[PDB]
Protein backbone atom coordinates (compact mmCIF):
# COMPACT_ATOMS: atom_id res chain seq x y z
CA UNK A 1 0.00 0.00 0.00
CA UNK A 2 1.82 3.06 -1.29
CA UNK A 3 1.12 6.80 -1.35
CA UNK A 4 1.86 6.97 -5.08
CA UNK A 5 1.70 10.76 -5.43
CA UNK A 6 3.90 11.23 -2.36
CA UNK A 7 6.59 8.87 -3.68
CA UNK A 8 6.65 10.35 -7.19
CA UNK A 9 6.92 13.92 -5.89
CA UNK A 10 10.39 15.03 -4.81
CA UNK A 11 11.31 17.45 -2.03
CA UNK A 12 14.56 19.20 -2.87
CA UNK A 13 17.12 21.62 -1.45
CA UNK A 14 19.15 23.64 -3.96
CA UNK A 15 21.39 26.69 -3.75
CA UNK A 16 22.58 29.14 -6.40
CA UNK A 17 24.79 32.22 -6.70
CA UNK A 18 23.76 35.45 -8.41
CA UNK A 19 26.12 38.34 -9.14
CA UNK A 20 26.18 41.73 -10.80
CA UNK A 21 24.58 43.90 -8.13
CA UNK A 22 24.28 47.68 -8.45
CA UNK A 23 23.65 50.10 -5.54
CA UNK A 24 20.05 51.37 -5.19
CA UNK A 25 18.80 49.27 -8.14
CA UNK A 26 16.41 46.32 -7.79
CA UNK A 27 18.16 42.98 -8.29
CA UNK A 28 15.54 40.43 -9.35
CA UNK A 29 15.90 36.65 -9.02
CA UNK A 30 13.11 34.86 -10.86
CA UNK A 31 11.31 31.80 -9.55
CA UNK A 32 11.19 29.03 -12.13
CA UNK A 33 8.29 26.97 -13.41
CA UNK A 34 7.07 23.53 -12.19
CA UNK A 35 8.49 24.09 -8.70
CA UNK A 36 6.36 24.83 -5.63
CA UNK A 37 8.73 26.87 -3.50
CA UNK A 38 8.41 26.48 0.26
CA UNK A 39 11.24 28.70 1.50
CA UNK A 40 13.78 31.12 0.06
CA UNK A 41 17.06 31.95 1.80
CA UNK A 42 19.20 34.83 0.52
CA UNK A 43 22.73 35.43 1.77
CA UNK A 44 24.34 38.77 0.93
CA UNK A 45 28.05 38.06 0.63
CA UNK A 46 29.08 41.70 0.18
CA UNK A 47 32.63 40.88 -0.86
CA UNK A 48 33.82 38.96 2.17
CA UNK A 49 31.78 41.14 4.53
CA UNK A 50 28.50 40.35 6.26
CA UNK B 1 -23.49 48.15 0.41
CA UNK B 2 -22.09 51.68 0.50
CA UNK B 3 -24.30 54.75 0.38
CA UNK B 4 -23.87 57.08 -2.58
CA UNK B 5 -22.68 60.54 -1.59
CA UNK B 6 -24.84 62.95 -3.64
CA UNK B 7 -22.66 65.98 -2.89
CA UNK B 8 -19.37 64.31 -3.89
CA UNK B 9 -20.09 61.33 -6.16
CA UNK B 10 -17.46 59.49 -8.16
CA UNK B 11 -17.40 57.54 -11.40
CA UNK B 12 -16.20 54.07 -12.36
CA UNK B 13 -12.57 53.01 -12.59
CA UNK B 14 -10.32 54.66 -15.17
CA UNK B 15 -7.49 52.80 -16.97
CA UNK B 16 -4.18 52.65 -15.12
CA UNK B 17 -0.74 51.21 -16.07
CA UNK B 18 -0.74 47.44 -16.40
CA UNK B 19 1.52 44.51 -15.48
CA UNK B 20 2.75 43.41 -18.97
CA UNK B 21 -0.11 41.06 -19.91
CA UNK B 22 1.80 37.89 -20.86
CA UNK B 23 3.63 37.89 -17.53
CA UNK B 24 0.34 37.17 -15.73
CA UNK B 25 -0.26 34.12 -17.95
CA UNK B 26 1.47 30.87 -16.90
CA UNK B 27 2.79 27.92 -18.86
CA UNK B 28 0.94 24.60 -18.52
CA UNK B 29 3.82 22.64 -16.95
CA UNK B 30 4.45 19.60 -19.15
CA UNK B 31 4.61 16.25 -17.24
CA UNK B 32 6.97 13.50 -18.46
CA UNK B 33 6.34 9.80 -17.78
CA UNK B 34 7.62 8.26 -14.57
CA UNK B 35 8.29 4.96 -12.88
CA UNK B 36 8.45 3.57 -9.36
CA UNK B 37 12.00 2.34 -9.74
CA UNK B 38 13.49 -1.04 -8.98
CA UNK B 39 12.28 -4.62 -8.71
CA UNK B 40 10.39 -4.98 -5.43
CA UNK B 41 11.08 -7.81 -3.02
CA UNK B 42 8.17 -10.07 -2.17
CA UNK B 43 8.57 -10.21 1.60
CA UNK B 44 10.25 -8.31 4.43
CA UNK B 45 12.15 -9.55 7.48
CA UNK B 46 9.87 -7.82 9.94
CA UNK B 47 11.04 -6.71 13.42
CA UNK B 48 7.75 -7.77 15.05
CA UNK B 49 5.68 -10.92 14.68
CA UNK B 50 2.42 -10.52 12.78
CA UNK B 51 0.29 -12.88 14.86
CA UNK B 52 -1.73 -12.68 18.07
CA UNK B 53 -0.37 -12.98 21.58
CA UNK B 54 -1.87 -14.15 24.86
CA UNK B 55 -2.47 -11.91 27.87
CA UNK B 56 -2.41 -14.62 30.54
CA UNK B 57 -0.77 -18.03 30.75
CA UNK B 58 -2.93 -21.09 31.39
CA UNK B 59 -1.68 -24.21 33.15
CA UNK B 60 -1.61 -27.26 30.90
CA UNK B 61 -1.81 -30.87 32.06
CA UNK B 62 -0.98 -34.35 30.87
CA UNK B 63 -2.43 -37.58 32.22
CA UNK B 64 -0.28 -40.09 34.09
CA UNK B 65 -0.98 -43.55 35.44
CA UNK B 66 -0.44 -44.90 38.93
CA UNK B 67 0.94 -48.43 38.97
CA UNK B 68 -0.02 -52.00 39.69
CA UNK B 69 -2.32 -51.98 42.71
CA UNK B 70 -1.37 -54.57 45.32
CA UNK B 71 -3.18 -56.28 48.16
CA UNK B 72 -2.82 -55.47 51.83
CA UNK B 73 -2.57 -57.06 55.27
CA UNK B 74 -5.46 -55.46 57.14
CA UNK B 75 -5.77 -55.44 60.91
CA UNK B 76 -8.93 -57.38 61.29
CA UNK B 77 -11.68 -56.73 63.86
CA UNK B 78 -12.81 -58.99 66.66
CA UNK B 79 -15.86 -61.24 66.51
CA UNK B 80 -19.18 -59.71 67.58
CA UNK B 81 -19.95 -62.11 70.43
CA UNK B 82 -22.29 -59.52 72.01
CA UNK B 83 -19.37 -57.24 73.00
CA UNK B 84 -19.35 -54.40 70.48
Q: What is the DSSP letter of B24?
A: G
CA atoms within 13 A on the CB side of A15: 4
Q: What is the CB neighbour count within 10 angstroms for residue A30?
A: 5
Which H/E stretch holds residue A8?
A: helix A4-8
CA distance A20 to chain B (A): 24
Using an 8 Å Cβ cutoff, are B11 and A16 in contact?
no
> Is the Cβ pair B36, A34 closer than 8 Å?
no
Question: CB-based burial of residue B23 (10 Å sphere; 0-12 exposed, 13-18 middle, 19+ buried)?
Answer: exposed
Q: End-to-end CA distance of chain B: give it in Å, rounded.
A: 124
CA–CA distance, B7 with B5 (Å, rounded to integer): 6
**Nearest-10 Cα torsion for B63, B69, B72, B74:** 50
Q: How was this structure determined?
A: cryo-EM
Q: What is the resolution of this structure in A?
A: 2.8
Q: Is A16 on the interface with B (CB under 8 A)?
A: no
CA–CA distance, A32 with B65 (Å, rounded to integer): 88
Amino acid sequence: ILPLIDLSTLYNLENSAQAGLTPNVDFVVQYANLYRYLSTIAVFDNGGSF
Amino acid sequence: MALINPQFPYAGPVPIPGPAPTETMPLLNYRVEGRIAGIQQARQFMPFLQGPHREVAEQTYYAIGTGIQMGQTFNQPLINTQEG
